[PDB]
Amino acid sequence: LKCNKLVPLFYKTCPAGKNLCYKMFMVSNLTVPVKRGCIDVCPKNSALVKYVCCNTDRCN
């Protein structure tokens, strides 16, 4: 359950309250991640700002 906040900040372990990791960003240069965080709802996406949900180490 060790995730990171943003990119230039990273985070650590956010156990309790949350349960999975979640990244949110959009197209810019080569499919690059801009937002992350540990939460419990990462459903739906879009075409400009897509949200992904991780749940295994390197991401939560």
From Swiss-Prot:
The lineage of its organism: Eukaryota, Metazoa, Chordata, Craniata, Vertebrata. It is found in: Secreted; Target cell membrane. It comes from the Eukaryota. Belongs to the three-finger toxin family. Short-chain subfamily. Type IA cytotoxin sub-subfamily. Basic protein that binds to cell membrane and depolarizes cardiomyocytes. It also shows lytic activities, but 2-fold less important than that of CTX-A4. It binds to the integrin alpha-V/beta-3 (ITGAV/ITGB3) with a moderate affinity. It may interact with sulfatides in the cell membrane which induces pore formation and cell internalization and is responsible for cytotoxicity in cardiomyocytes. It may also target the mitochondrial membrane and induce mitochondrial swelling and fragmentation. One of its GO terms (cellular component) is other organism cell membrane. Expressed by the venom gland. One of its GO terms (molecular function) is toxin activity. Disulfide bonds join C3-C21, C14-C38, C42-C53, C54-C59. Monomer in solution; Homodimer and oligomer in the presence of negatively charged lipids forming a pore with a size ranging between 20 and 30 Angstroms. Keywords: Cardiotoxin, Cytolysis, Disulfide bond, Hemolysis, Membrane, Secreted, Signal, Target cell membrane, Target membrane, Toxin. This is Cytotoxin 2. One of its GO terms (biological process) is killing of cells of another organism.
